[PDB]
Design a protein around this ligand. Structure first.
Ligand code: HEC
Ligand code: UMZ
Ligand code: CL
Length: 395
């Protein structure tokens, strides 16, 4: 009997990789799929072909936003925002933005530790079960990014609540996304004019905005940087830490090891990054030329989806890919942060967020365990991240 073209994404579950991924990688590591919009795309699932695509700018991020292109999903932002990093670079702002979002600012790591410990103390006081997503990982991400941006902690929750819509992976445009986007842009425009905001990313952007060397950079770009980096950083660190905590809880031997030897936590987090399923969709690129990828000649104008867990569970690059092994020879060579032109600018901050969050959790609740059977986690659908709606634990 006839079947439709293979549809992506395969599963919204972030606690297991579908067997279909390895079968695809082995039989057809670049293969045609249908996205939720109905568009066809090339799904790339081997490490070698994923890196090839991400390292060839002729597979363009920016052009995925072009009118009439085959789409993975509907834009939730103005099309120029897809090229936000490119616009930042063209405005002469890349170095300043990068420096503002490193975890090395004085007191930043102590802020993370203090915040994590305070959130955990509150959970211990409230008593089990505790929701490690809504009452730990996401508030820690939100507090971190208010600090990094230089904006008041009390503004975090409202900005955060845009994100369950802003990072939707939808077949169609989302009216609420524009409502929240325009509102959050207005907020950050006000931040740039707010004399109290003198630290962090927005403090620096506010200064550069009045510097004659940036007098022709648009106010829209300055505001957009704030919304984009808050949203990307918070959704990415919150979702990654949440699904990392699941992987850690499901490995009590690793939890005990990292609890007893915290110096191993960075290597543990690198492996948790490698096996992380937080990205719900392949990374999209639009071909701007005819390009050979494996056995397929990708044609100009076609959509390519780089499946991160395809690369990161590829046994030809990461032997025994499903196992967390702290002594791999190539531990940071995973694609959790992408690769090439669009490699994540917040990679160092995301690493520190997770390392400190896990260190604090293991000290405060060494006996942490799921409080529900793992299958009972509710996996958010049609979203750019895989996350459980609640993460109930006991300890
Ligand atoms: C505070 C900012 C920030 C943080 C923190 C952050 N991201 Fe990023 N990330 C970005 C931005 C902005 C981009 C777009 C870069 C570009 O287009 O050049 C990006 C790009 C990426 C990409 C590549 C996307 C592509 O299409 O090539 C991946 C993958 C990624 N981030 C994953 C993560 C993960 C995983 C984490 C946490 C563990 C994280 N990011 C934390 C802001 C952030
Ligand atoms: C693929 C998907 C999304 C993006 C973005 C914007 C991400 C964002 C930020 C805040 N609210 C909503 N979305 C920039 N480059 C991208 C590539
Ligand atoms: Cl504050």
């Amino acid at each position: 009997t006839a079947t439709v073209l293979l549809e992506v994404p395969f599963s919204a579950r972030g606690d297991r990789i579908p067997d279909a991924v390895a079968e695809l990688r082995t039989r057809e590591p670049i293969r045609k799929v249908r996205t939720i919009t109905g568009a066809e795309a090339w799904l790339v699932s081997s490490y070698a072909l994923c890196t090839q695509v991400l390292e060839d700018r002729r597979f363009s991020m920016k052009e995925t936003a072009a009118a009439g292109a085959p789409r993975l999903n509907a834009l939730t932002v103005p099309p120029e925002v897809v090229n936000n990093m490119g616009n930042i670079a063209d405005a002469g702002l890349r170095k300043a933005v990068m420096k503002a979002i490193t975890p090395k600012a004085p007191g930043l790591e102590q802020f993370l530790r203090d915040t994590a410990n305070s959130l955990l103390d509150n959970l211990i006081t409230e008593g089990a079960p505790a929701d490690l997503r809504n009452d730990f990982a996401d508030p820690l991400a939100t507090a971190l990014h208010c600090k990094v941006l230089g904006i008041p902690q009390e503004d975090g929750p409202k900005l955060f609540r845009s994100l369950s819509i802003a990072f939707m992976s939808s077949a169609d445009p989302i009216p609420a996304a524009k409502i929240n986007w325009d509102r959050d842009i207005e907020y950050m425009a006000g931040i740039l004019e707010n004399p109290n905001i003198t630290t962090g990313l927005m403090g620096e952007l506010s200064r550069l905005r009045k510097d004659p060397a940036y007098s022709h950079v648009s106010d829209e770009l300055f505001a957009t940087i704030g919304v984009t980096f808050f949203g990307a950083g918070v959704i990415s660190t919150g979702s990654f830490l949440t699904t990392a905590l699941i992987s850690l809880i499901q490995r009590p031997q690793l939890r005990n090891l990292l609890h007893e030897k915290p110096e191993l936590i960075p290597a543990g987090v690198e492996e948790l990054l490698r096996i992380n399923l937080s990205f719900a969709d392949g990374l999209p690129r639009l071909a701007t030329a005819d390009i050979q990828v494996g056995d397929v000649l990708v044609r100009k104008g076609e959509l390519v989806l780089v499946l991160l867990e395809g690369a990161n569970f590829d046994p030809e690059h990461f032997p025994n890919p499903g196992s967390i092994e702290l002594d791999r020879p190539n531990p940071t060579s995973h694609l959790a942060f992408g690769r090439g032109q669009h490699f994540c600018p917040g990679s160092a901050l995301g690493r520190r967020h997770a390392q400190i969050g896990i260190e604090a959790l293991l000290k405060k609740m060494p006996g942490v365990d799921l409080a529900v059977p793992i299958d009972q986690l509710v996996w958010r659908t049609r979203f750019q991240r895989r996350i459980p709606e609640r993460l109930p634990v006991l300890w």
